[PDB]
Each structure stands twice: as C-alpha cells, then as structure tokens.
C-alpha cells in the first residue's frame, strides 16, 4: 500500500482552466506487481546487474505501483526489494533508486529531515516540498516524519515535523510554513474534483469570495498568508484575474513588492504552483542543475514526484523558456544509470 | 563631522595579499567645504536646477567631505542641505542624492530598517550591509539606526537594532547576524593596520591560529566564530592552511556544510575576506538583474564602494561579466540618476 494512496490528490491534476495536466507516467494497465517483482529480482541474479531491466520496471510505475511491487517482492521471496537495489547498485545510481522505491510521503519526510538537520535551514526545500502538498498528503507526509526519526535513531517521544520546523523557523515565514503543515488550506471534496472535466471549474470556485479577497489584500498581518496559503489552486486564480482587473497590477506583482525574503519566495511559489506552475516547476528544474552537480536530490526528487502529475506540461514549459529540452539540459548534467533513470522518469525509453 | 570618521576603517582597504584595494573617490586635495557649499548653493538658483554642477561635486567626495559640506551649507546659509537638494530636485535623481548627502551609517542604518519593516525580511539587504562593517562601524551603525526609529515616529524607549533583529531573524542565521552586529570580530589596532604597506600581512595574521580554526572546522558555533571573528587577513590565511591540509577549500566545505540564509551569510563574509572583488560585482550584477530596482542595493553599493575598492570591483565586473560596470548600469538607468552613478564610478562630464 501507500501513504498517499493509489494517486496523487486530484487537486493537482489541472490546469486553472479546468484542463487535465499532462504527465509521463500513467497507471499501468495490466499491472501486475507480482510479474514486475519477479521481473526485478531476475535482473538482479549473476555477479552483476540488469540496470535497464530494473530502470524500464521502476522508472516507468506510478509510487502506488512501485510499492505494490516492493510489497509483492516481500512476499514472493521473503527478501527486502529496497535492500537488495541497495546491495545490487552503487554511486548516483543506487540513490535515484532508494528515491524512487520509497512511499513518497517517506520520501518527501526524509529531504524536509535532512532541509533542517544541519547548521541554517534550506528554506528552499521547505518551500520547495510544502508548495506541492495538500492537506491530506501534508498529514502522510508529517506521519512518515515522525517513522524518519524513528528511523534514524530518535527516542524522542514527542517530536514531530511541527516540532522541527517551529525551531528551524520563525517570523512571517514560519506562520506561512505552518498554516501549510497544519494542513488547513480549503478542501475541495473528491467528488467535485472528480466533475471537473464535466461541470468545469466554476462549479468549485466562487466570484464573492474571490472579490473579497482581491479588495482585502490591495488593503495591504496573516491577511496576504490567510488568501495565498488556504484558497484552492483553482480559486486562487481566479483572485488572481480579479485582482488584475480591479487594480491593473497584477496579484504577482503586489505580493512581490509587499513582501521580502523567504516570506516573499514561499508566497510567490503557493501562488504560481496555482497560476503559472509549469513555468514554475521548470525554472526549479533550471536552479536544481544550474552551476554544477548537485541539486541532485532535488532534481530527482521533481522528477520522481511531477513524472505522475504534469510533468509533460513542465517540459514543454522548459523548453520554451530556456531553448533546450529538459532531456537535454539533464542529459548534460548527469551520467551513468542515475542519467538513464531520468530520462526513462520523463518518458525516453531504452533497449 | 561623520559618525563614521574621516575614512571607512582601514581594514577594508587591502586585498589578502595586503596590496591597496584602488577606490574611485579619494580625499580631494585644497578640500574646501565653503567653496563646494557655495557652489552648490548657487546651482540651485533660479527656477531650474544645474544638475551637473551638483553631481561633479557630491559624487566627487568622500562621506567625510560630504558629511563637512552639509555642515559648511548649514552655517553658511542657515539653510538645510538636504533639505535645499531635495526641493530642487526629483524622480530618481533625487533618491540618488538623499542617499549621497547622508553620512554614511545613516543610509545604511535607513537600508536595515526598511529591509525589516514589511512583511518578511530583506535577507539579502542584511547579509550585504552587515557583511561589509567592521565592529566600529557597526556600532555606528546601531547608533544611526536608533535615530532612524526616532526619525520615523518611534516612541518606544528601547527598541534597537538589536531588538529589531532578534524579532526579525532566528536560528544559526541569527546567532551569525547577532555576532557581528554585536560588533564583537578580532580587531587589528590602527597603528597595526597602518603598517601593512610596510610590514606586509604576515605581521597582523597567526600561523598557529589558522592552523587549530581549519583543524577545528574540519571537524554549532563553531563555523561562525571562524567565519565571522577573524580578520580578512586571518582569514584568508585560514582558507589556504585548509587547502593545504585537506584538499577542499574552505568555502567548498561551508558549502555542502551549511544552508539557506546561515550559508548565504557565511559565504560573503569569506567571500568578502578572499574573493571580495567578484563578490561584489556579483553583488551589483544582481542589483541590475531582470528589471530596475534594486535600485537602492545599486546605489548603496556604488556610493559605498567608491571609496574603498570600486576600481578593483569594477575590473572584476569586466572579466566575469564581458561588459564593463559601466555600460550595465548606463543600460538598467536613466537620467541624473545616470549621470551620477556614472561619476561616482569615476566618469566625469
Ligand atoms: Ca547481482
Ligand atoms: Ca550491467
Ligand atoms: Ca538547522
Ligand atoms: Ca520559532
Ligand atoms: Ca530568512
Ligand atoms: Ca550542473
Ligand atoms: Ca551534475
Ligand atoms: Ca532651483
Ligand atoms: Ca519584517
Ligand atoms: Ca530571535
Ligand atoms: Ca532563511
Ligand atoms: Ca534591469
Ligand atoms: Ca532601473
């Protein structure tokens, strides 16, 4: 099973106009976790590795189906699949893999741990992960937190993700941070979100709140973090129009220049994730390469987790905002098997 | 008079290798504070401005100089300088010269409160004016900044600097940012520092010392008292015993050893010790990046900077960059707001 079932939440799924973001990842039909078990375990057999085999099975299930496969594998052979990737891999390419055949919420637990065990906070993870969360996975996310201290030798009894962060955090910033953790932004119920395709997005967003909101904020205090961090991403654009149309700035642009710092950034993020997210997510992608080696966990860790959302919207994004292909600029930056996992995440199949 | 004294401290005025860091603006020779007072008074007449006139003067002075004009104006015309200049003037060009007629610690006390005020913090604002003052600095600084709650409406009794900060900033960050605010670095006494064309650096720097704090980092407070207390000079030392030792760099290791804003800060204070050149070109780069503002990091950064090592920064601009500092801030602005930049950098029209 999975902390965050058999998908992500469809609060994710499209696009301010109601249409359904691409990504490059699909459920499988015909899934059968035990045939991809056997299939791994296969690859594994002899003094060396079947990479390609492994990589063509892993890279291309959705994280329910990769964990049904390590459940499955546990069963059919009373052995430990994350145990015996490890044992079977090494350098970049066994790490892409430890991400890719964790639970996501784990996953995202383990990157929030590491964001603030550490001399200062990688603010930019924080911001980075939390952005990309609603409220229910917010709670998976912080119970996989609590099994990473477990895991890492913690006999704390009462710390928590909360707990972490009120210490690693503080100011506007910190209030903003936790609203998101305390997982109370606006819910949409599983069956509107389900009708979008049909009724379309008017049915789940609303005029009056949005004008309310739009004159509240040109008033401007937990008013700007109360309207980005909880309105939907759906009636968070529609402020966003409004307010354009009522003020002839932008919401963007308000919000920059009446905000500063992590504030500032964690604000502009919740707020394009809602009204300009492929451009958002591939600029990420852009920053994680940029340089040298090394965002390697937080390009993994976008790849891994968009490929099953938008992660085709992304690219094409990418592509036409720095004039190569997101293959390309990735291609450039990494190498071995770690390389070739990447590339299969976003849709390039080999052998 | 200026709270900061005739000159910046002389601690920022040689690279590690202890050779003078070259400024556009030097102390001028015949200085007469009337003479400039007159002559700016004068260009204010009529009901238009000379621009120029005022611009070859106050962007052809030091804070000290400047500092002594506004008090020169003051007698010599029972009128307030600042005051004269902005009536006279507008737009951007009169931000430029509210920010060139105010002693130095003032401006900068004026950045550090506007970059708290507001929602969320100005990191950014803190780390670049905090990492560029040494301890007496900062204390005039402070000074200002009280004055600066004054200034602004404030009849709270003992809010400070220091206040403003702690309630503004948390974490390793805050601990780093309190340290220097503190004013608590390693000082090197001005008969020392004076000596330094003749005695070199080796006089006013420690082997035995560098070699325990690379020893000791290697290895919590323990970065930032490193990063933050020692002198440049001590610092720069410490960065090569710690290649030498261990094949890493010292900023490659505070690197992967810190993040966010702690790691941002402990790399400019480094950065401003062994690599201050780029850094602050990188720094105005930034101020130019995307779009007009930020306009005052840019102007904060060209007044400041002229008198101590605007030259050395400019030709690192040139060879990171492939344009001269010139042309990229004669491309992002217009106007006397130009021109003055312009002659800060030392062009004269
Ligand atoms: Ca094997
Ligand atoms: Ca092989
Ligand atoms: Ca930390
Ligand atoms: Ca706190
Ligand atoms: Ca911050
Ligand atoms: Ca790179
Ligand atoms: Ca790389
Ligand atoms: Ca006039
Ligand atoms: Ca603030
Ligand atoms: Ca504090
Ligand atoms: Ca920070
Ligand atoms: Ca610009
Ligand atoms: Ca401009």
Same mark, same amino acid.
């Given at each position: ?35 991809? +078990?056997?299939? *791994?375990?296969?690859? @594994? #057999? /002899?003094? =060396? !590795? %079947?990479?390609?085999?492994? $990589?063509? &099975? ?50 995202? +637990?383990?990157? *929030?741990?590491?964001? @603030? #065990? /550490?001399? =200062? !906070? %990688?603010?930019?993870?924080? $911001?980075? &992960? ?222």
């Amino acid at each position: 099973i999975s902390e965050f079932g058999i998908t992500r939440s469809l609060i994710h799924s499209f696009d301010p106009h109601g249409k359904h973001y691409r990504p490059t990842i699909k459920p499988t039909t015909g899934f059968s976790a035990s045939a991809d +078990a056997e299939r *791994l375990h296969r690859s @594994m #057999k /002899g003094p =060396g !590795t %079947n990479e390609l085999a492994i $990589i063509n &099975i892993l890279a291309r299930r959705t994280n329910y189906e990769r964990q049904e496969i390590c459940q499955s594998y546990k069963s059919l052979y009373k052995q430990d699949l994350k145990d015996d990737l490890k044992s079977d891999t090494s350098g970049d390419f066994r790490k892409v893999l430890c991400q890719l055949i964790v639970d996501t919420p784990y996953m995202l +637990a383990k990157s *929030l741990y590491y964001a @603030m #065990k /550490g001399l =200062g !906070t %990688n603010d930019r993870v924080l $911001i980075e &992960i939390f952005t990309t969360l609603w409220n229910d996975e917010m709670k998976a996310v912080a119970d996989a937190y609590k099994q990473v201290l477990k895991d890492k030798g913690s006999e704390e009894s009462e710390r928590s993700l909360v707990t972490d962060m009120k210490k690693e955090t503080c100011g506007d910033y910190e209030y903003a941070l936790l609203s998101l953790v305390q997982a109370e932004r606006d819910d949409i119920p599983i069956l509107q979100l389900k009708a979008i395709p049909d009724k379309g997005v008017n049915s789940i967003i609303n005029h009056e709140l949005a004008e309310a909101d739009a004159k509240d904020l040109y008033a401007s205090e937990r008013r700007i973090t109360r309207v980005i961090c909880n309105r939907t991403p759906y009636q968070l654009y529609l402020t966003s129009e409004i307010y354009f149309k009522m003020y002839g700035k932008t919401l963007l642009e308000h919000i920059e220049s009446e905000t500063s710092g992590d504030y500032r950034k964690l604000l502009v993020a919740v707020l394009r994730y809602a009204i300009d997210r492929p451009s958002l997510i591939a600029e990420w992608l852009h920053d994680s390469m940029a340089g040298l080696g090394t965002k390697d966990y937080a390009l993994m860790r976008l790849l891994i987790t968009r490929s099953e959302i938008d992660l085709q919207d992304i690219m094409d994004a990418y592509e036409s905002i720095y004039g190569k292909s997101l293959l390309n600029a990735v291609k450039d930056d990494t190498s071995g098997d770690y390389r070739r996992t990447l590339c299969v995440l976003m849709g390039e199949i080999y052998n």
